[PDB]
Structures are given as structure tokens and as C-alpha cells.
């Protein structure tokens, strides 16, 4: 496989004696492939397929 290079950012962190250490939130924009199983219509008018 072609190796993935990516930009990793620790933005909006703080060091203020919050007891022990903890991880609040991680986010990234990759996904393995899949198939369609269901679709629905929300209240604002968007058709959403899961």
C-alpha cells in the first residue's frame, strides 16, 4: 500500500493541574469502504444514507 502521511495537530490544549492526564477528543478523516444498508429523511429536509 501507499503509505499515509498526515498532519497531526495538538491544538486547543491546556496545562492547568487537572488531576491526572486525560484525552478529550481525537478526530481524523479516513474510513474503510462499506455498503449501503439504510436511508432516511430528517426533519430539515436532508436525505441521509447510513
Amino acid at each position: 500500500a501507499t503509505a499515509a502521511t498526515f498532519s497531526l495537530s495538538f491544538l486547543n490544549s491546556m496545562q492547568q493541574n487537572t488531576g491526572a492526564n486525560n484525552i478529550v477528543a481525537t478526530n481524523q478523516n479516513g474510513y474503510k469502504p462499506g455498503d449501503l444498508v439504510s436511508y432516511q429523511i430528517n426533519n430539515d429536509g436532508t436525505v441521509v444514507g447510513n
Binding site: 462499506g34 444498508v37 439504510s38 447510513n50
Partner: protein, 50 residues
């Protein structure tokens, strides 16, 4: 009109049974399962198998 069916999400009686693979939750939280298709569901009923 009918707006919606609402649910009373307060936790109930904790009853002892003495098995090995039985878990309960004392406050907010749900167990998280995946199905055969990859659909992700959430639950409160703790009674497992092998």
C-alpha cells in the same frame, strides 16, 4: 397531533442473580454493539453469552 413517543430513561432495580457474565450500569451510559452488517447499536440490557 402526535409529537412523539418519549421514554423514561431513569434506571431501575438492581437485582442480584449470581452468574458470571452479567453486568449492570449504575448511572448514565450504554453498552455499544456491532451487528453482522456493521451497523452500530446501543443497549442497556447486560446479559452476555459466548
Amino acid at each position: 397531533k402526535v409529537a412523539g413517543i418519549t421514554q423514561d430513561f431513569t434506571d431501575g432495580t438492581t437485582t442480584n442473580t449470581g452468574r458470571g457474565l452479567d453486568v449492570a450500569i449504575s448511572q448514565n451510559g450504554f453498552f455499544r454493539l456491532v451487528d453482522s452488517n456493521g451497523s452500530v447499536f446501543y443497549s442497556r440490557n447486560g446479559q452476555f453469552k459466548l
